[PDB]
Assembly symmetry: D2
Homo-oligomer: 122 residues x 4
């Protein structure tokens, strides 16, 4: 297989509509679902040091609320997300974070809540 890393950006004109390092604010989804899912807002603590890794996740989505963050993926390469940007990360995709703004705030929705993380041995 592999699902594809899938990125969307918010068009700046209002179009697109049809009819140690971080701290976390919990939505309560983990407790509500017994850890089947988690959802939390991640904020940067106000560069440093990109590391290829993977997560033992089924579902994983990020939506940028404030600031900017640059990710890199084994399939699609480097992508810069600003507020309104979203990144769907396939199960276990090899990726890294390249850099982020000091005001970054991003919502993460994941399954399971309690995923493991492994550094890619290159």
């Amino acid at each position: 297989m592999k699902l594809q890393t899938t990125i969307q950006h918010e068009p700046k004109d209002g179009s697109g509509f049809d009819r140690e390092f971080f701290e976390y604010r919990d939505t309560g989804v983990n407790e509500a679902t017994g850890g089947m899912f988690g959802a939390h807002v991640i904020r940067a603590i106000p560069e440093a040091k990109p590391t290829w890794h993977t997560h033992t996740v089924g579902f994983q989505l990020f939506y940028v609320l404030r600031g900017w963050v640059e990710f890199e993926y084994e399939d699609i390469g480097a992508v810069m997300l600003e507020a309104g940007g979203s990144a769907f990360q396939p199960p276990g995709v090899r990726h890294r974070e390249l850099r982020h703004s000091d005001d970054l705030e991003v919502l993460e929705i994941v399954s399971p809540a309690g995923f493991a993380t492994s550094v890619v041995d290159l």
Copy 2:
């Protein structure tokens, strides 16, 4: 049998809380096409109340702008502003009471192609 509980969180103001259909339009994150319909995620914006259920496993709303008031069978009326989130258990009976003209809300749901049923009140 047993049911999960509708789970609401609000963003403190403050900045604490961190631990170290036809009247709407939709912007797709691409998660439906990325996952073959297992999941969907989209931003919903208002364009300037009927009890119902959805055939969903997972369903979460995160308010990006404005405000929206929902009502739930289990927990009653809930007013959400930016930063507020509502986890809606599978098939929970609920309705939307009112919203702001500037409402923007992210919805994450499994599956993408859920059905909606009006609740038989009688």
Copy 3:
């Protein structure tokens, strides 16, 4: 998109290893998960009448425990499953059941438990 209907058959030689109409026996998964998932064994009540349809499901898998059943899918066509056979059905795939043995027993694992079913209007 679309994920692909995925069938496996149990090799008859022990290989493959590496190192109204129906009644239902519940595993308890629906109650345990608040309807996020369901799992139950379906048995035939001891022909009749194939109807193209879809289900509002994320995940859906069948594993045949006894007897045989012939399904048909919009993507892969007709497939006959015997004991040990499995069918992964993509979210909302158009399919039908063509015929089954009178002793059919099949395990279904689904998300959500409470999916809707729609007849395909042809």
Copy 4:
């Protein structure tokens, strides 16, 4: 916070109940490759006990042949025979105590690529 409960069912004998790693080998249903790793499902057979957890959302076992005894932090030791099922909550602490030489069990799990951790007993 809150946790789902390990949920066991047994097949009545009778026929009622219907309502109208290195010591094992594995046969893949194809669900991992079909779903890009969101889910996996495989049949496990014995080849003729350490507390641990898995980083899984969904996890279900259905015994096809033989018997297997598990032990759970929440509900204790459980003996399963053919037709028995065990739903294992996300990350539940558990272990396998013993099994029959002819054990065959279907496992359905999300994600396919979960990690396993030995429980720190001290």
